[PDB]
Ligand binder design. Structure first.
Ligand SMILES: *[C@@H]1O[C@H](CO)[C@@H](O)[C@H](O)[C@H]1NC(C)=O
Length: 361
């Protein structure tokens, strides 16, 4: 099994214990750590944070302890956005400048591969993405001739049917990618007006839950479209999503006025780290969605959909039963990386629960 784990470069800045640098990562926890995100500047791959050269080195030092560990650099992300990626990929000359830039940058900085995180290609982009992936892979092939182990190529792909059909020729891109991380944790958000879970494994039968907005549906679709199981990695979140409730109702379909209040550490409305959520559960009422197989919790006017040790193990058992390549984790700096929040003196509780299932059998 692969266990693909993202480390975000902006986590460093969080206050107090929310601060996460790459030396916090257990070298043996994941098979592959992906550093998020790289820029494109002058049509070439580039650093993002002022100190990314230092933190790339911190990350790459982890291989001293675990020489089998692989690292990738993820280019794109949401601040980068779509339109910038579109401009690069749709023209022969900028595409080539970018693709040429990648192997030398990665080798300089100690990375084993590239992760493409274009969030997200429009309908006019689907064919360019195909070309980009094929051509990037071919440049990696060529570059292996010089005697170092071929660079890995991966891609982060959204899990909604609509975004998949719009942007991605899955049958073609799966031929050239070494794995595809399926983003099976954005099925609900504050744009909806009611509470709901963003990472359910199956449909909720009570709600008239659009048949597609669940991990199983997404995995089955990707397979149906031609992604080989042995390339497909299923995403599992260590964050949860929060909502502010519009009434005393807490139940399936309960109305919301907006995203939840920001976390003490993550300081972003609508999202909490798992460490934050362990704190939130003190004095919260907990519930599980039985059909969807994922928990939520509530306290005052706040309502939080999240994943716990039991739900992440459950998702790991599912992906193994479907003979998937493994799991992806968004993100290491959102699990209880310190180990001190969740009453168990155990660093990376969610990620290690996933790991221990994937090792079992
Ligand atoms: C990324 O590259 C763009 C385009 O060159 C540049 O304008 C921007 O400052 C860069 N972003 C960061 C954060 O480095």
């Amino acid at each position: 099994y692969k266990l693909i784990c993202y480390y975000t470069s902006w986590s460093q800045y969080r206050e107090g214990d929310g601060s996460c640098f790459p030396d916090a990562i257990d070298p043996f926890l994941c098979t592959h750590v992906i550093y998020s995100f790289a820029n494109i500047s002058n049509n070439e791959i580039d650093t993002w944070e002022w100190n990314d050269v230092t933190l790339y080195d911190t990350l790459n030092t982890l291989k001293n302890r675990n020489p089998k560990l692989k690292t990738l650099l993820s280019v794109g992300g949401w601040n980068f956005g779509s339109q910038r990626f579109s401009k690069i990929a749709s023209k022969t000359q900028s595409r080539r400048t970018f693709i040429k830039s990648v192997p030398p940058f990665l080798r300089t900085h100690g990375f084993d591969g590239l992760d493409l995180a274009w969030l997200y290609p429009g309908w006019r982009d689907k064919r360019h993405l195909t070309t980009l992936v094929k051509e990037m892979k071919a440049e990696f092939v060529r570059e292996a001739q010089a005697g170092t182990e071929q660079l890995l190529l991966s891609a982060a792909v959204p899990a909604g049917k609509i975004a998949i059909d719009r942007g991605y020729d899955i049958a073609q891109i799966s031929r050239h990618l070494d794995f595809i991380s399926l983003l099976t944790y954005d099925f609900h958000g504050a744009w909806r007006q009611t509470v709901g879970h963003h990472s359910p494994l199956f449909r909720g039968q009570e709600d008239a839950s659009s048949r597609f907005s669940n991990a199983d549906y997404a995995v089955s679709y990707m397979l149906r479209l031609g992604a080989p199981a042995n390339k497909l990695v299923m995403g599992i979140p260590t964050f949860g999503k929060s909502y502010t409730l519009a009434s005393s109702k807490t139940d399936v379909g309960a109305p919301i006025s907006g995203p939840g209040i920001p976390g003490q550490f993550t300081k972003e409305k609508g999202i909490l780290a798992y460490y934050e959520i362990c704190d939130f559960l003190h004095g919260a009422t907990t519930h599980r969605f039985r059909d969807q197989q994922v928990p939520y919790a509530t306290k005052g006017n706040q309502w939080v959909a999240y994943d716990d040790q039991e739900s992440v193990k459950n998702k790991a058992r599912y992906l193994k039963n479907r003979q998937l390549a493994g799991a992806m984790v968004w993100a290491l700096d959102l699990d209880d990386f310190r180990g001190t929040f969740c009453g168990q003196n155990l660093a990376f509780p969610l990620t290690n629960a996933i790991k221990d299932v994937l090792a079992g059998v």
